[PDB]
Amino acid sequence: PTVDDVLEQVGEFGWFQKQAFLTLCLLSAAFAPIYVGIVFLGFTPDHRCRSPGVAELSQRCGWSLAEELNYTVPGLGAAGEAFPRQCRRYEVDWNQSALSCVDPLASLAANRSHLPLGPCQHGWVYDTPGSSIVTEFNLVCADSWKVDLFQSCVNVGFFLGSLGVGYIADRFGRKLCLLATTLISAVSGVLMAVAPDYTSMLLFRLLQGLVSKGSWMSGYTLITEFVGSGYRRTVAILYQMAFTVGLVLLSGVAYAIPHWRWLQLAVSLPTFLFLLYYWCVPESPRWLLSQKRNTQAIKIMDHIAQKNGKLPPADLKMLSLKEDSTEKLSPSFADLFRTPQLRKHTFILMYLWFTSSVLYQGLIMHMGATGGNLYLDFFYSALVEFPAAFIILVTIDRVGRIYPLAVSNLVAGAACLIMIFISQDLHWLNITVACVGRMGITIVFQMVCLVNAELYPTFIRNLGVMVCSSLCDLGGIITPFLVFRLMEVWQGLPLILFTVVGLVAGGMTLLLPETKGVALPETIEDAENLGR
């Protein structure tokens, strides 16, 4: 009368499982905006120093946007690529000076560089009709570094939340966390749009980043526990796929409304609707059974059978774990580093997460020149993944869950290697090679997440995945400085490091035990002898 058997008797993947999966998918899409970053909320358009006198002259004679930029703004390429043109103003009086539009400023100085440069007061004038956070607070030239501060603070908040948010979810149940965390994320998101100053917005974003990771991973583990053993692959992969679909929808809606405040409010509000949809999904039976609350476990098991429409088995009265467990099974950080096998698995998974994150960031950094439209580039970036999801689904069932991950990691490493050695000059081959590498990285990410979730015991699963994911955020934070520093030593040093890291990760993946068609463990001692 183990949990898996009764779950099989009523139905592994029935009407109930599909219903829960639909709402969990809705939750998954809602996590994309927080993790996308500042791409659609902090895009920096072209900008020049506002000048009161230019407005009067703009209407006197025929003018064009291109023409105005050329012989009204200081020229670029002097003492920097574009530093002068960006945020320097000549300050030559353009008002009460009828010098003809043919020769507005040429006559005065007979030279452009030698003309006087003043402060870039009067705020700024931006190109895009929409408004971004940069445009809101003039974080352009003097405070340009504040954008880096904001993004780095968000990343640090994400790392800390990954390190900490797991324990509350594990100890107090998965439904409770998925409710409180998503509620906090929703109330903060709608609050950010009303943030008056720079500090308040940063604080609200930090809170949202601290909680969203916990929300998403709690949902993931809940659905994975609910689905039967055989169909774990399908549910997990399609959950990640729903996250990608949400990303695509985010790109579309972002193009729809450019204003950042309205975008944030519109993205945040539906999270309250999801919170309304909490009534459906109950607590995971496995967690309740491990916590020794068998009465609620059996009550839930009756409902799923009712919704499935299949008669429940008569043996539920004696439902319990395989062996008589202890009264208390409290999770703790200490328990995560006691069993040598568990310690080895944790180290390997942490290293795999770190390598995946660093290699992904490196690959996106070494890409080609960005396209004219940011939205189209982001849409293609998201679109590349769906074939990756299709490939992952087919191979997991038959090949296993180790060889695909190892080969994908090695493929990403080799893609970086070929990008380095073979001619990297602009060619049609480079874009396809980059897409291949991106596909490999996506496969690595999905496989790592699935295997890590499936490897740990049930009563600590969320905490383990959280800790092993924190290294992903750490690597994402640290890699840019590493790549900038290494470039100084030698021209192509970074790509050699990427290739060696990928090869080592692919080699190390082999030690991890396979998990093809094996019921996920529920006791630490049971997980110790998983390989044997």
Ligand SMILES: *[C@@H]1O[C@H](CO)[C@@H](O[C@@H]2O[C@H](CO)[C@@H](O)[C@H](O)[C@H]2NC(C)=O)[C@H](O)[C@H]1NC(C)=O
């Ligand atoms: C950009 O601005 C410069 C201003 O110096 C333009 O140079 C002038 O070009 C016109 C013809 O288009 C000539 O009649 C002027 O004599 C040029 N100025 C000087 C000081 O010699 C330049 O053509 C502009 N380029 C574009 C693409 O707009």
Ligand SMILES: CN(C)CCOC(c1ccccc1)c1ccccc1
């Ligand atoms: C779905 N594909 C695109 C990425 C899978 O990893 C996701 C990811 C990784 C860990 C936790 C959540 C989501 C990712 C998104 C953006 C940047 C880095 C990682």
